[PDB]
Every structure is written in C-alpha cells, then in structure tokens.
Amino acid sequence: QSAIDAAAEKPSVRLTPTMMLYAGRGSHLLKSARYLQQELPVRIAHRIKGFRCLPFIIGCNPTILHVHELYIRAFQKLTDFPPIKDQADEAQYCQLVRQLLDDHKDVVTLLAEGLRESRKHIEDEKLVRYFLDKTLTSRLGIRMLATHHLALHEDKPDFVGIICTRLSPKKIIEKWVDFARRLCEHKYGNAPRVRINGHVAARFPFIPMPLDYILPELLKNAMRATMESHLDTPYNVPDVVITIANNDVDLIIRISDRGGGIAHKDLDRVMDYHFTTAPMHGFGFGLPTSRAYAEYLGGSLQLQSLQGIGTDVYLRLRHIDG
Amino acid sequence: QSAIDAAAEKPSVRLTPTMMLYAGRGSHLLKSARYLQQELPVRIAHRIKGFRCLPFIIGCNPTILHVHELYIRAFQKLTDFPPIKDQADEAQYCQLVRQLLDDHKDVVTLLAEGLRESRKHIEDEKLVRYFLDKTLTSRLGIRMLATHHLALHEDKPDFVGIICTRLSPKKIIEKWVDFARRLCEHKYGNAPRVRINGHVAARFPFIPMPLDYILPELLKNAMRATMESHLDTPYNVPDVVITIANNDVDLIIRISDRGGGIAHKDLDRVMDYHFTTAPMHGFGFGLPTSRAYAEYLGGSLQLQSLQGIGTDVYLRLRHIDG
Numbered sequence: 067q068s069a070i071d072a073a074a075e076k077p078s079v080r081l082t083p084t085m086m087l088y089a090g091r092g093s094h095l096l097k098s099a100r101y102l103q104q105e106l107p108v109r110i111a112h113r114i115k116g117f118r119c120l121p122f123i124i125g126c127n128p129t130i131l132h133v134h135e136l137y138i139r140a141f142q143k144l145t146d147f148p149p150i151k152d153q154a155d156e157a158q159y160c161q162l163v164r165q166l167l168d169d170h171k172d173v174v175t176l177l178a179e180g181l182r183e184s185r186k187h188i189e190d191e192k193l194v195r196y197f198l199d200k201t202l203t204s205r206l207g208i209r210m211l212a213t214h215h216l217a218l219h220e221d222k223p224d225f226v227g228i229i230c231t232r233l234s235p236k237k238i239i240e241k242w243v244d245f246a247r248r249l250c251e252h253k254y255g256n257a258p259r260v261r262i263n264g265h266v267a268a269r270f271p272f273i274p275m276p277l278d279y280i281l282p283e284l285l286k287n288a289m290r291a292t293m294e295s296h297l298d299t300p301y302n303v304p305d306v307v308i309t310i311a312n313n314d315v316d317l318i319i320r321i322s323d324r325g326g327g328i329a330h331k332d333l334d335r336v337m338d339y340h341f342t343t344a345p346m347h348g349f350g351f352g353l354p355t356s357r358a359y360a361e362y363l364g365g366s367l368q369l370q371s372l373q374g375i376g377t378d379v380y381l382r383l384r385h386i387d388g
Numbered sequence: 389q390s391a392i393d394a395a396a397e398k399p400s401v402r403l404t405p406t407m408m409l410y411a412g413r414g415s416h417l418l419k420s421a422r423y424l425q426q427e428l429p430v431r432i433a434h435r436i437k438g439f440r441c442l443p444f445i446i447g448c449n450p451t452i453l454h455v456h457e458l459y460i461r462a463f464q465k466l467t468d469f470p471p472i473k474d475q476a477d478e479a480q481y482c483q484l485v486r487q488l489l490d491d492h493k494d495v496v497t498l499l500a501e502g503l504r505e506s507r508k509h510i511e512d513e514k515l516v517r518y519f520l521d522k523t524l525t526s527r528l529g530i531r532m533l534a535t536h537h538l539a540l541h542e543d544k545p546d547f548v549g550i551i552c553t554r555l556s557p558k559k560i561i562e563k564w565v566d567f568a569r570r571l572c573e574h575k576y577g578n579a580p581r582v583r584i585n586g587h588v589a590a591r592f593p594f595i596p597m598p599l600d601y602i603l604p605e606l607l608k609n610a611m612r613a614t615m616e617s618h619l620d621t622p623y624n625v626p627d628v629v630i631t632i633a634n635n636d637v638d639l640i641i642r643i644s645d646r647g648g649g650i651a652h653k654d655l656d657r658v659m660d661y662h663f664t665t666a667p668m669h670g671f672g673f674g675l676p677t678s679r680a681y682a683e684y685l686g687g688s689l690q691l692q693s694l695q696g697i698g699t700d701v702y703l704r705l706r707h708i709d710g
C-alpha cells in the first residue's frame with residue numbers, strides 16, 4: 067500500500083522513560099493519546115518494511131504472508147481513525163489499541179512456525195535471529211506505549227502508567243519464584259528453593275513489564291537444569307541464588323544455579339531461536355528473547371557457564387533517569 | 389647481528405604438554421636438552437624481532453635499549469654453546485639456562501619503566517598492551533621449557549619436570565590463600581576468610597607454574613577490594629568464595645568477592661598495564677598479566693562486576709591431553 071510506503075521512511079520518535087512521567091492534569095490524557103495515535107502506525111510500518119525486505123522465497127511462506135497481512139491490516143485500522151481532539155476521540159482510540167494488542171497476540175508464534183518451515187531456503191544464519199530480535203523488540207516497544215497509555219486511565223498505586231515509582235527488585239523476583247517453582251514441581255516432583263541476597267531493600271522507579279518476562283524464563287531455566295542434574299536425589303537439590311546489585315548506573319540481577327552448567331558444544335547455540343535440549347521448556351525462546359529484551363532496554367544478558375557445577379546468568383538493565 | 393636475523397624467521401617449535409611427558413630412560417635427558425638448546429635461541433630471536441619492530445623513538449629509550457641489549461647478549465651466550473652430544477655437554481648447558489633465568493629476572497620491570505617514560509611518544513593505545521602481552525607470554529614459554537628441563541634432573545614426587553601428575557586445584561588455591569591473607573592483614577589489619585567449594589577433590593595432570601602467579605594476584609585483588617569496601621567494619625568482612633569446576637575440556641576457578649565491584653568508569657581500564665586505584669597493589673600488572681597468561685595456555689580470564697556488591701573472576705585453563 068502507498069500509505070505504508072510513506073510511514074516506513076518516517077523516523078521513530080522515542081519517549082524516554084524519564085520523560086514518560088508527565089501524567090499530571092485530564093489534558094495529559096489527550097496529549098499522550100495524540101502521541102500514541104501518531105507513533106503506533108510508524109512502528110507498524112517499520113515492521114512491514116522488514117517483511118518487505120525478507121528474501122522472496124521466505125516472505126512467500128503462507129504463515130509469513132499471513133503475519134505480513136496482519137501487520138498491513140493493523141496499519142490500516144490505526145491510520146483510518148480520525149485525529150484526537152476531545153475525550154470522546156481519546157476513548158475510541160483506546161479500544162483500537164486494545165484490539166491491536168489482541169489481534170497480534172500470536173504473531174511471534176506464527177512467525178517462528180513460518181521461519182522454521184522455510185529452513186531449507188534460509189542461507190544466512192543471522193537472518194532468523196535478527197528478524198525475530200527486531201520483531202520481539204518492536205512488539206515490546208508497541209506494548210510499552212500501548213499499555214502505558216491504557217494504564218494512565220487507571221489509578222494504580224505506586225504507578226504512573228507502566229512505570230512503578232517504588233519498584234523493589236526483591237519483590238518482583240519473589241513474585242516469579244513461586245510461579246516457576248510450581249511449574250518445575252509439576253514436571254520434576256520438586257523444585258529448588260531460591261535465596262535472594264544483596265540489595266534486597268533497594269527501591270527505585272522502573273518499568274517492570276520486561277522483568278515480568280525475563281525473570282520467569284531465567285528461573286525456569288535455572289530450576290530445570292538443577293533438577294535434570296540431580297535426578298538421583300530429586301528431593302535434595304541445591305538452592306538457586308539470586309543476587310541484586312543496585313548501583314547508580316544499572317540494576318544487576320545474577321541468577322546462580324548448581325545445575326551442571328551449559329556444555330561447551332551447546333554454549334554457542336543457546337542464544338539461537340528454537341535451540342533446546344528438552345509448558346516450561348521445549349521452545350528455545352527463553353534466552354534469545356530475554357537478551358533481545360535486555361539489550362533493547364540499554365542493558366545486557368550475559369551467561370557464565372561452569373561446566374560440571376552450574377551457571378551464573380547476569381541480567382543488567384539501565385536505570386530510569388539521564 | 390646477522391645470526392639473530394637468521395633465527396627470527398625460523399618458526400617456533402612448540403612441545404605440547406601431553407608430549408612433554410616423555411621422561412623415561414638417562415637418554416631422555418639428552419633428547420630434551422638437545423631440543424632446549426635449539427629452541428631457546430629461536431624464542432629469544434623472536435623477541436629481538438619485536439624490539440626491532442618497535443617505533444624508533446620508543447626503541448631508542450635507554451631502558452628499552454638496555455633490555456634489547458640483554459636479549460641480544462642472551463642469544464649470543466646461548467648460540468655460542470656447542471651442540472649436546474654427551475652428559476657433560478648436557479650438564480654445562482643447564483648452567484647457561486640457569487644464568488639466563490637470572491640475567492633476565494628484571495626484564496619486565498625495566499620494560500615497563502622504559503615504556504612508561506615513552507608515554508609522550510606512544511600514539512597507538514594497543515602498542516604497550518600488545519608489547520607487554522607478547523613479552524610476558526614469551527617469557528612464560530621460555531621459563532616453562534627451561535624449568536621443565538632443569539626439573540627433569542630432580543626426582544620430585546608427583547611430577548614429570550613441571551607437569552604435576554596429581555594436581556589438586558583445591559590444594560594449590562589453599563597454598564596461596566594463606567599467603568595472600570598474610571599480605572592483606574599487613575595492610576588492612578585483617579583479611580577475609582576464603583571458602584572453597586565445587587570439585588574440591590578433583591585431581592588431574594596439570595602445569596601449576598601459571599597458577600602460581602594468577603591465583604595470588606587474583607586473591608590479592610579480591611581481598612583488597614573486600615577490605616577497602618568494609619573499612620568501617622574491618623573485622624567483620626565477607627568471605628571470598630572460590631568455586632572449582634573441573635570438566636573434560638577445562639578447569640574453571642571462579643573467585644567471587646563482596647568487595648563492591650569494579651566501577652563502570654574503570655571497567656575498560658582494569659585490563660590495561662599500569663592502571664590501578666591504589667607490596668600487594670600499586671602496580672597495575674595483576675589483571676593484564678593474568679589474562680595474557682590464561683590466553684597463552686588456551687584459556688581465559690573473564691570479569692563479571694556487580695557494582696555495589698562485588699565481582700566474580702573466572703579463570704579458565706584448558707586441560708592437558710588432546
């Protein structure tokens with residue numbers, strides 16, 4: 067479509083987490099919605115550009131074509147909406163944003179299926195990794211903007227949209243610990259206990275949304291490895307130790323397990339999409355998605371394998387405030 | 389000299405640690421000495437080539453020139469010796485090797501002084517790091533060959549020259565722990581206790597010589613950081629935890645301290661020669677020498693800083709046997 071061509075070239079306008087805390091007023095609701103209305107089609111068109119740039123044989127896969135078609139229909143639905151002038155115009159847009167978040171819920175699952183089906187034709191090894199990294203980060207960016215504006219309507223305590231003003235890293239870790247242990251216990255009959263140390267009382271403004279994905283994935287990985295390495299003593303398994311290091315530059319969460327580590331042969335494949343050695347696991351998405359997430363947010367995800375003993379996983383996320 | 393020109397081009401012949409275990413027979417003494425006699429001048433000439441390749445203004449420094457002159461006189465002394473035919477010819481060579489090890493004892497200290505004096509003229513940032521990395525590794529290579537042949541005369545238990553047949557990583561760590569604590573206690577009035585865990589009963593053939601330098605340097609660093617971060621409670625300081633991970637590919641020694649970590653601003657300078665934030669410390673050689681050492685021996689030295697909490701230092705060394 068010619069309308070998509072125009073918005074693909076248009077540069078992306080990023081709203082810094084520090085700037086995002088401008089929710090005062092309800093004139094602040096209109097100001098935010100007017101931004102969301104202009105910024106959402108640009109992000110969609112940038113991704114349509116990525117589908118258009120895929121090699122022909124891959125872009126032709128019926129599942130890839132379907133996802134491409136979903137992105138085009140999404141851009142159509144969003145741009146057709148008239149500009150926001152009053153609180154009635156702001157209200158109807160929120161319903162399009164909520165529909166966008168539901169119509170595109172399974173885009174990554176269809177994209178992985180389509181890309182996997184096209185294995186025979188994929189020559190560039192990096193092609194799939196870069197396409198999924200770019201898709202996953204754009205979606206996080208869109209979901210961040212969309213959830214933030216939708217959350218501005220609610221009067222959620224300790225939050226300004228999706229920014230928590232008083233986030234405790236200990237609390238968010240604790241939240242996922244019991245959730246991962248319940249999944250682990252289901253498959254292995256037991257789960258390792260988790261110990262949290264370091265800056266346990268650190269409290270700071272932060273966006274928990276990315277941590278809500280990364281932490282359960284990293285805890286599921288650490289727990290599965292601990293269980294698969296202690297199969298002969300499933301009830302006597304070593305604890306997973308999480309350390310919080312909060313400094314003025316970044317937040318570091320180190321997840322140290324005694325699960326035998328990542329084998330030297332698998333060490334270069336663990337960060338590849340679909341690579342697994344196994345619903346908890348048997349997907350191969352946990353690590354590459356978590357790294358793409360951490361890096362998109364000015365951080366990093368680093369692995370330190372001690373083969374025969376365990377692994378230390380270092381999640382770093384840059385603090386809010388420049 | 390024209391004789392040096394000839395041996396600079398001659399490729400280096402490396403004796404694999406696995407091959408080195410050929411001490412049988414005393415015809416094995418002659419076979420080894422005949423190799424040492426031919427290989428030692430090649431290693432010296434390769435380094436003379438490095439001095440000849442330094443930029444003129446740097447090579448002209450009187451201290452640099454003196455070290456260059458030491459390498460030339462060393463090559464002269466070694467090549468002038470007649471080939472080894474009998475046990476009297478083998479015996480006299482061992483005295484030249486022992487003299488070589490003493491005449492060149494302070495080469496690195498003079499080289500660092502000369503290179504530091506030439507700071508104003510050094511344009512390439514990597515120049516000093518690569519020169520010292522190459523000097524330190526060549527010396528380790530020469531010292532390995534020289535000490536191995538000299539040790540073949542002794543009947544040291546559990547050793548074949550410099551290869552320990554039954555090395556315990558726990559024991560060698562323990563050996564340096566009390567030594568580093570005594571140095572640390574002298575400056576800070578106390579020292580952190582050290583805890584060793586993991587493959588504590590692992591025993592394997594290995595060359596301890598590089599570990600005899602790396603371990604005390606890494607323990608001195610971890611202990612100094614722990615003391616400087618707990619200055620208000622110098623008698624209540626956290627333990628330094630060393631983990632041994634012995635697998636079929638490599639030996640991993642992780643030294644984890646709660647010494648506040650390496651600051652983000654210093655993180656890229658810590659591996660540079662002379663960089664320090666301070667006879668234990670105030671040298672800036674510990675980290676870059678240890679990494680050059682680990683890498684020369686098919687391993688690595690990796691740092692993981694948790695700013696505000698501590699640092700994890702990962703020493704990896706490839707096992708003996710291909």
Ligand SMILES: Nc1ncnc2c1ncn2[C@@H]1O[C@H](COP(=O)(O)OP(=O)(O)O)[C@@H](O)[C@H]1O
Nearest residue numbers: 287288291327342343347348349350351352353
């Ligand atoms: N803590 C860990 N210890 C050992 N291996 C791990 C650990 N975390 C991840 N891995 C390895 O990395 C592979 C890929 O991980 P991930 O991307 O999370 O996928 P999945 O959990 O679906 O298998 C896993 O199958 C596993 O072999």
Ligand SMILES: Nc1ncnc2c1ncn2[C@@H]1O[C@H](COP(=O)(O)OP(=O)(O)O)[C@@H](O)[C@H]1O
Nearest residue numbers: 609610613649664665669670671672673674675
């Ligand atoms: N465990 C550690 N924790 C914190 N900082 C460290 C640690 N190890 C090294 N460093 C930093 O790296 C610098 C350089 O280390 P090194 O090369 O060992 O030199 P030196 O010990 O002579 O200062 C140190 O001055 C220190 O600031």
Ligand SMILES: Cc1ccc(-c2nc(-c3ccccc3C(=O)O)cs2)cc1
Nearest residue numbers: 166167170171174202205206208209279
């Ligand atoms: C336009 C749009 C619609 C839905 C989304 C969603 N993203 C998620 C998600 C959450 C965690 C890890 C990955 C993902 C992922 O599918 O991208 C769920 S719905 C993002 C953008």
Ligand SMILES: Cc1ccc(-c2nc(-c3ccccc3C(=O)O)cs2)cc1
Nearest residue numbers: 488489492493496524527528530531601
């Ligand atoms: C020909 C020759 C002579 C002496 C040597 C020595 N090397 C050391 C040493 C030990 C540990 C860390 C560094 C060094 C270092 O000075 O290279 C001491 S004497 C190496 C080669």
Ligand SMILES: [K+]
Nearest residue numbers: 336341350353
């Ligand atoms: K993976």
Ligand SMILES: [K+]
Nearest residue numbers: 658663672675
């Ligand atoms: K240093």
Ligand SMILES: [Mg+2]
Nearest residue numbers: 283286287352
């Ligand atoms: Mg996973």
Ligand SMILES: [Mg+2]
Nearest residue numbers: 605608609674
């Ligand atoms: Mg040191």
